[PDB]
Design an enzyme around this catalytic site. Structure first.
Site, PDB file in Angstrom:
ATOM      1  N   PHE A 136      -7.656   5.232   4.669  1.00 48.52           N
ATOM      2  CA  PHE A 136      -7.222   4.366   5.754  1.00 48.52           C
ATOM      3  C   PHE A 136      -8.379   3.641   6.526  1.00 48.52           C
ATOM      4  O   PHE A 136      -8.212   3.328   7.697  1.00 48.52           O
ATOM      5  CB  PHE A 136      -6.313   5.162   6.732  1.00 48.52           C
ATOM      6  CG  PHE A 136      -5.016   5.645   6.101  1.00 48.52           C
ATOM      7  CD1 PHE A 136      -3.955   4.771   5.895  1.00 48.52           C
ATOM      8  CD2 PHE A 136      -4.872   6.973   5.707  1.00 48.52           C
ATOM      9  CE1 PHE A 136      -2.748   5.197   5.276  1.00 48.52           C
ATOM     10  CE2 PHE A 136      -3.694   7.429   5.102  1.00 48.52           C
ATOM     11  CZ  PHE A 136      -2.622   6.532   4.879  1.00 48.52           C
TER      12      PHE A 136
ATOM     13  N   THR B 146       0.848  -1.200   0.000  1.00 45.25           N
ATOM     14  CA  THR B 146       0.000   0.000   0.000  1.00 45.25           C
ATOM     15  C   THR B 146       0.881   1.247   0.000  1.00 45.25           C
ATOM     16  O   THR B 146       0.588   2.199  -0.722  1.00 45.25           O
ATOM     17  CB  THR B 146      -0.898   0.098   1.235  1.00 45.25           C
ATOM     18  OG1 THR B 146      -0.140  -0.328   2.377  1.00 45.25           O
ATOM     19  CG2 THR B 146      -2.126  -0.799   1.086  1.00 45.25           C
TER      20      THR B 146
ATOM     21  N   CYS C 143      -6.826   1.827   9.738  1.00 46.37           N
ATOM     22  CA  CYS C 143      -5.403   1.538   9.691  1.00 46.37           C
ATOM     23  C   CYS C 143      -4.630   2.055  10.916  1.00 46.37           C
ATOM     24  O   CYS C 143      -4.551   3.254  11.135  1.00 46.37           O
ATOM     25  CB  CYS C 143      -4.797   2.153   8.425  1.00 46.37           C
ATOM     26  SG  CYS C 143      -3.066   1.659   8.193  1.00 46.37           S
TER      27      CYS C 143
HETATM   28  C1  HEM Z   1      -0.586   4.191   2.519  1.00 46.34           C
HETATM   29  C2  HEM Z   1      -0.438   2.966   3.006  1.00 46.34           C
HETATM   30  C3  HEM Z   1      -1.602   2.269   3.711  1.00 46.34           C
HETATM   31  C4  HEM Z   1      -2.911   2.293   3.377  1.00 46.34           C
HETATM   32  C5  HEM Z   1      -3.585   3.027   2.183  1.00 46.34           C
HETATM   33  C6  HEM Z   1      -3.621   1.451   4.334  1.00 46.34           C
HETATM   34  C7  HEM Z   1      -4.966   1.212   4.342  1.00 46.34           C
HETATM   35  C8  HEM Z   1      -5.653   0.404   5.208  1.00 46.34           C
HETATM   36  C9  HEM Z   1      -7.073   0.190   5.208  1.00 46.34           C
HETATM   37  C10 HEM Z   1      -8.098   0.841   4.219  1.00 46.34           C
HETATM   38  C11 HEM Z   1      -7.356  -0.659   6.213  1.00 46.34           C
HETATM   39  C12 HEM Z   1      -8.795  -1.157   6.574  1.00 46.34           C
HETATM   40  C13 HEM Z   1      -9.017  -2.479   5.851  1.00 46.34           C
HETATM   41  C14 HEM Z   1     -10.427  -3.025   6.122  1.00 46.34           C
HETATM   42  O1  HEM Z   1     -11.336  -2.304   6.653  1.00 46.34           O
HETATM   43  O2  HEM Z   1     -10.681  -4.215   5.774  1.00 46.34           O
HETATM   44  C15 HEM Z   1      -6.111  -1.006   6.873  1.00 46.34           C
HETATM   45  C16 HEM Z   1      -5.938  -1.842   7.963  1.00 46.34           C
HETATM   46  C17 HEM Z   1      -4.758  -2.251   8.561  1.00 46.34           C
HETATM   47  N1  HEM Z   1      -3.490  -1.805   8.262  1.00 46.34           N
HETATM   48 FE1  HEM Z   1      -3.124  -0.215   6.861  1.00 46.34          FE
HETATM   49  N2  HEM Z   1      -2.717   0.968   5.243  1.00 46.34           N
HETATM   50  C18 HEM Z   1      -1.464   1.425   4.892  1.00 46.34           C
HETATM   51  C19 HEM Z   1      -0.302   1.168   5.569  1.00 46.34           C
HETATM   52  C20 HEM Z   1      -0.137   0.312   6.631  1.00 46.34           C
HETATM   53  C21 HEM Z   1       1.108   0.061   7.355  1.00 46.34           C
HETATM   54  C22 HEM Z   1       2.471   0.766   7.100  1.00 46.34           C
HETATM   55  C23 HEM Z   1       0.843  -0.864   8.303  1.00 46.34           C
HETATM   56  C24 HEM Z   1       1.813  -1.476   9.345  1.00 46.34           C
HETATM   57  C25 HEM Z   1       2.759  -0.760   9.953  1.00 46.34           C
HETATM   58  C26 HEM Z   1      -0.546  -1.236   8.196  1.00 46.34           C
HETATM   59  C27 HEM Z   1      -1.183  -2.163   8.999  1.00 46.34           C
HETATM   60  C28 HEM Z   1      -2.535  -2.405   9.053  1.00 46.34           C
HETATM   61  C29 HEM Z   1      -3.184  -3.369   9.938  1.00 46.34           C
HETATM   62  C30 HEM Z   1      -2.518  -4.265  10.993  1.00 46.34           C
HETATM   63  C31 HEM Z   1      -4.652  -3.266   9.614  1.00 46.34           C
HETATM   64  C32 HEM Z   1      -5.785  -4.028  10.289  1.00 46.34           C
HETATM   65  C33 HEM Z   1      -6.215  -3.114  11.447  1.00 46.34           C
HETATM   66  C34 HEM Z   1      -7.281  -3.765  12.328  1.00 46.34           C
HETATM   67  O3  HEM Z   1      -8.374  -4.115  11.809  1.00 46.34           O
HETATM   68  O4  HEM Z   1      -7.042  -3.934  13.554  1.00 46.34           O
HETATM   69  N3  HEM Z   1      -1.113  -0.496   7.172  1.00 46.34           N
HETATM   70  N4  HEM Z   1      -5.091  -0.360   6.207  1.00 46.34           N
END
Ligand code: HEM
Ligand code: HEM
Ligand code: HEM
Ligand code: HEM
Lengths: 428, 423, 423, 428
Positions: free
Chosen positions: A366, A241, A373
């Site tokens: 996010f 991402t 996120c």
């Molecule tokens: C620009 C980069 C990123 C974008 C656009 C992004 C976007 C998202 C989105 C939209 C979700 C929600 C997914 C859902 O509702 O099914 C999510 C969840 C998550 N992301 Fe990110 N993310 C990014 C970077 C990161 C990074 C760098 C990490 C780790 C350091 C990360 C770790 C996580 C985790 C662990 C979840 C699950 C959270 C939960 O439900 O407890 N993401 N991300």
């Protein structure tokens, strides 16, 4: 309720038998409007595109995160890590509480040095190119974000800048998107490595909070197994991402030279020292705006899924039963003319100059609520640092007049995007 | 640091003892360059005129909005309204969060019908003039902008077009002062209480909760905001339309190009929302008028921490800056040599303009939230004006710029010859 | 004259039909002594192994460099470059005169900064390894030497440390052969033409006039020379560092003595030119590695006139000799009995070694002009390696020497434990 | 411009009121660097020490040979012979053209037999010494080089090996370096002898080319007077310098036994016949290297002088006017660390193993351009022959552990240098 073309008893399913399903869905949303029904044999879901409906969907008392078909399959290797667990599974909330501090300003200041380590390798790679060599943008952005999450997260060096051929995970993802034997082999490779990293471990990283951390709520730590799932999860969620964002951002910059010059002037005026400080990255306001606008147009995790917790009526016209699924189509949300204006396709970071002007729930690259996120500040910090450095150290040329071509996996990236970089010869 | 002429123990203060202080300051800036020390007894500020220094001043991590001496005195009637509040006051951020989305370019769709109501009153006034008669331009533009905010802001009709002529009395400066404040408060508080839903800012204020604190504005702060809408966004917009009309009459090829756009775009008896969005050239004309005479021509800043301006000028935490916007808008390294010429074509592509080079609406989170409102109103009215009449600079008017807290071309008069196109 | 086993009409040729011909020839030399006849159909040569005969072979009035069968085939891509030209070719002496001073021990001062650039890339690669990980020694030394000549030779960056992996394809041997030559020529000729001044050999070539003829090299011969730099002085130097590291790990008291010198001399974050000149013991280590496995292990000669070798063996004008350098370096009457032991102390005083007894860089005017370059590079890198890491022979590596036109220890792997000393 | 200590109105002159002026000047050059000013009452000159400046000075379009104060005085007996004439004097170029063929390979093959004659007398002298007698090295080298130039040059036998006391010239040289009456008497002795040798003269020598030779340019021969000057000149220029070289070379050999053994092995391997052939001498490559390295450290004609033909700027920092003088200090040139390395004081003949490696104008023990030593091949041939024979026939011992002590006349020699020779008993 609108519904796209059908295929006999396959209903709508073959619509997604394409390399570019999210983009196909965006085009269906343009013809059918803010909501449509999508049926496959044995399932239904409704695709949402307008801020008006998406904001109701974001109401946590009415809707909770669903695991889509894609995520259910990813769960075969990501287990009950944060990204692929249900809110009500004991391990979601435990890990959620344990991991929040890992994304604390205190901790972000901690990661800054390791982010700079990888950023420096990226800038040296480009300084060392010969005249009339070019840069493979997503390939290099991927090398960076993988190394960065490897190093910041678990003190492990992927050494991507030392290789052509990569370190399995991408083969596991594609299959989810003989096959069985391979998949199993891939799960195993990920597992031994990670489990080995865990067993082997005094460091300034995410793995540490996980080893030494107790959930204040239950007083329990994560067992080693959920720990490996969490580690697998950082690599699947918080790398490609971020890679896509930097690649989309550079793309928009080279397509919009006046925006490039504003960001470049900001990087020169702000990044006064040979390597950026934490505080200097926080000062890169315009670069942050460029990244948000890149995220508005091409959110690189472009869909998330929800289920109705109870019978409920959406928008006052669409009744839902308990368990009914919704998909938020983020790029269409981000193109909602009633929110953003009629010029939604233009790249204008200044949409974000005065951020309180953005209505509630209009901008969601996010995700939403307690399931949003956690890596948001990390990813933006990394991307802002790296982009600032790139714009400080080089001029960029779209030498092929690249035509935007977006590859879809779980995430979005512009495939084949190449530029030439001309060094400003500024010492690193 | 350069500094203009001093007056013994009065230092630079007597230089501001003039009808035209901002114009005095522009002239000083011509003589001394991008920065000068201005000293008064008890206080000091630094006047900035180049894009090169102003771009650092606009860095929100290094500088924040300061209430000038003038604004500190407006705060006696404007209170902790948005214009006269400090960024760190709880009510700044609350009102900011509540008010800001209701000023989107997109929010103008709801105000459009009301802006047209007043714009149609303006056009009719002019159609109904007899043949030798002339238009008092800033007087009629002020009639229009005032009624437009009254109506869009709080569904209240000032009926300025049914009149010849206490708020303006207050901006002047100490006992009539108290009674002036009194009328505005009685008037505004009655309305608030009287108030059922309208397409106005007051509706949104009453129904509005701040996302951060979860709080609404209290009725009194809400009073301060309505007062502020009129203090902030009627005279500036009035000045703009008046300057714009002045430049158009002084540049007849420019007027002809704008009139052509108007005629080609405004195909219906009254303008629609989309049609106003399509007056590109009229928009360019307004931006160019704002370049030359930004109608709120200064804003003040203070250093949040010790910092160095332009590698040369150390400032300590709390040290003040004034951004002299008309000088910034005359910076030759940004605009080229012809800075005095009226050329709307500079805004052919507004995104070509460098960051912090064009700032008639101030800066960052403390910028003008009414920017799109003001431009939508000015574009619609100026589009209608150019559609419906030809204009004649019948006295060959000699620009004379009156200064209050804003700028306007005093005594500017024209004749209009109706083109006889119905409403 | 002794002669090894023959194969009917094929004579001795099938003895060379093996993966390891130089090693086959060493073994033959053990059995037959200081000289043997080697016959193939159409041709004959004589292999020399003792200092006693080799010292006469090195007499330049009696013998001149011959292009072996192998070199004659390298000449298809190396051309009349220095390595593959006959001494009497006009271009030999021209290039020799132009190129030779730019390879002085003193000329290394200009290459030093570039050698350090690549050496720092090597050290960082190793610091960045994870704990169970190992180093592929000749693969990383080849990365380093290749990039070092690219950069010192023509200010070109191969970026070998950013990669896993057509010239090497050519050394192997007949139609892909033509296309391999093609890439090198296009690549090198573009650079020449593209080329403004650098601290490289190409600069010197373009600005260089031969004192004798007063002529420069033409662009094409200049192409042949650049190709030759890489063919001649990357693999030999790579082999050397790899052999040196092998011997060090196999002799831990020797490693400890070298590491002590490194630590005592390399007091700065990167090595200076003078400091490298001061790694005496590291230099001794490299010379001893060259004694045992000279990485260009043979050179060929022809008799300029009828002459007699060692009072015993008449040769006619044009008769060929091959100097078997690893056997010469095992001559017991010069070195003593312990010739198989690795003992750097043999070079305590290099001038104690008899004339023509140690010849890893060939002979006379046809000797290696890159000798000081190669040793400066090897000493600097090996000094840095010993400063920054401890080394572990973790597989108890079994020496296996691969033969191309040069020698290297294939499959040699180690682990490095960082001493954590910053760059 | 640097300048050493001064002595009132004597300026720098008393600096040279020493037995060892060239060595004093070398030590001034070490403290002051590549150029210094030297003033005497009524004159100035600049001493040059670096290859960088010396190479410009060697540019014949900018600088021509000057006669130093020393040479001007020598001219009182050497007249307009080659060594002490100005380039533009008619007799320089005439004699230069007439004499070139006298140093032709054809002619060198001619001299070889007479060189061997004297070399044999030297080797017999040493064979005939009793046990524990020693050798006075420069005294014996001088006997050899004088006899050799006497015999090769004008078929005249000085018979130095038959005498303790010599054949005036050295007394004339010292005075130049009652006094008037002696000097005049000395000039006369040299003159009658030589003029008598000329008058008296069918031989394979330099005197013959001079008697039977016409300058191709002017078509004129040398008159008998310039002939005597030329004869005086061979003895002053081409004898003591050669003597010093052989003495310095033997010195360095006995001080460097590993170098001695390499040269000795070469002499045994190459000089297979009872007396050396011309071709065998040419094969003594290592012996040649030993002689060049001896010349690098102790060039036995250690200075030459130049004047600027026109106003010119030296090295881009030191402007010169027409007529300004320069002195090249050869031993300092030969110790230029930027050319030779930091070990410039060590004796390493292998500096010369690959001669094209020596930069232009870095090594100048035989002067420069059209005014360079014509006797260079002669002197090297003689020295190589004699040294080869010495190393072939004897082992040498530095029995007193001799301390280097260098006597200065026009030339340099190690005074008091003594060795013992042990005969290898190889028939001559
Ligand atoms: C620009 C980069 C990123 C974008 C656009 C992004 C976007 C998202 C989105 C939209 C979700 C929600 C997914 C859902 O509702 O099914 C999510 C969840 C998550 N992301 Fe990110 N993310 C990014 C970077 C990161 C990074 C760098 C990490 C780790 C350091 C990360 C770790 C996580 C985790 C662990 C979840 C699950 C959270 C939960 O439900 O407890 N993401 N991300
Ligand atoms: C052409 C017309 C206008 C111009 C040139 C203008 C100019 C400006 C400037 C320069 C500032 C910043 C002042 C400072 O930094 O001290 C400002 C702020 C402000 N303006 Fe405008 N303005 C215009 C129209 C309007 C309108 C139509 C409205 C309301 C309907 C309005 C409401 C405000 C308010 C409330 C602030 C204070 C915002 C804050 O600090 O939160 N203005 N204006
Ligand atoms: C340890 C490293 C090296 C070794 C062992 C080595 C060995 C040799 C040998 C034995 C020869 C003589 C070949 C013959 O007689 O046929 C030679 C020649 C040559 N080498 Fe090297 N070499 C080394 C490094 C280098 C480097 C670094 C360069 C250039 C940058 C180089 C350039 C050359 C060239 C051009 C020749 C041909 C010279 C001529 O004949 O004029 N070598 N080398
Ligand atoms: C190793 C022994 C010798 C050395 C080091 C030596 C060195 C030199 C030098 C440095 C000069 C240039 C002087 C100047 O520029 O003022 C010179 C000139 C000269 N030398 Fe030699 N020389 C040697 C042997 C000889 C011999 C054997 C001869 C006679 C056969 C000879 C005859 C001459 C003559 C005639 C000149 C003057 C050339 C001219 O200007 O035309 N030298 N010598």
């Amino acid at each position: 309720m609108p519904q796209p073309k059908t295929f006999g008893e396959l209903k709508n399913l073959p619509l997604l038998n394409t390399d570019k399903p999210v983009q196909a869905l965006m085009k269906i949303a343009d013809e059918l409007g803010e909501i449509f029904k999508f049926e496959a044999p044995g399932r239904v879901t409704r695709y949402l595109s307008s801020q008006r409906l998406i904001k109701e969907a974001c109401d946590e008392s009415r809707f909770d995160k669903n695991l889509s078909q894609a995520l259910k399959f990813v769960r075969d290797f990501a287990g009950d890590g944060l990204f692929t667990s249900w809110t009500h599974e004991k391990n979601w909330k435990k890990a959620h509480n344990i991991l929040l501090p890992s994304f604390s300003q205190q901790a972000m200041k901690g990661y800054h040095a390791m982010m700079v380590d990888i950023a420096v390798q990226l800038v040296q790679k480009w300084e060392r190119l010969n005249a009339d060599e070019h840069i493979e943008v997503p390939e290099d952005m991927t090398r960076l974000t993988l190394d960065t999450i490897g190093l910041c997260g678990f003190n492990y060096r992927f050494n991507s800048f030392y290789r052509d051929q990569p370190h399995s995970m991408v083969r596991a993802l594609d299959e989810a998107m003989e096959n069985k034997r391979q998949f199993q082999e891939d799960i195993k490779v990920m597992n031994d490595l990670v489990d080995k990293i865990i067993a082997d471990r005094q460091s300034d990283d995410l793995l540490t909070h996980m080893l030494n951390g107790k959930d204040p709520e239950t007083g329990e730590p994560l067992d080693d197994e959920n720990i490996r799932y969490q580690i697998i999860t950082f690599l699947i969620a918080g790398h490609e991402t971020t890679s896509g964002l930097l690649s989309f951002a550079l793309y928009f910059l080279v397509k919009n030279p006046h925006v490039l010059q504003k960001a470049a002037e900001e990087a020169a005026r702000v990044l006064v020292d040979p390597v950026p400080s934490y505080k200097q990255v926080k000062q890169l306001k315009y670069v942050g705006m460029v990244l948000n606008e890149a995220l508005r147009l091409w959110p690189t995790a472009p869909a998330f899924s929800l289920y109705a917790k109870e019978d409920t009526v959406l928008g006052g016209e669409y009744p839902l039963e308990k368990g009914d699924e919704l998909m938020v189509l983020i790029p269409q949300l981000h193109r909602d003319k009633t929110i953003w204006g009629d010029d939604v396709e233009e790249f204008r970071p200044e949409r974000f100059e005065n951020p309180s002007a953005i209505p509630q729930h209009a901008f969601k690259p996010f995700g939403n609520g307690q399931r949003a996120c956690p890596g948001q500040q990390f990813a933006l910090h990394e991307a802002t640092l790296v982009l600032g450095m790139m714009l400080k150290h080089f001029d960029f040329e779209d030498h092929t007049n690249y035509e935007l071509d977006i590859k879809e996996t779980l995430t979005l990236k512009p495939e084949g995007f190449v530029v030439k970089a001309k060094s400003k010869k500024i010492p690193l």
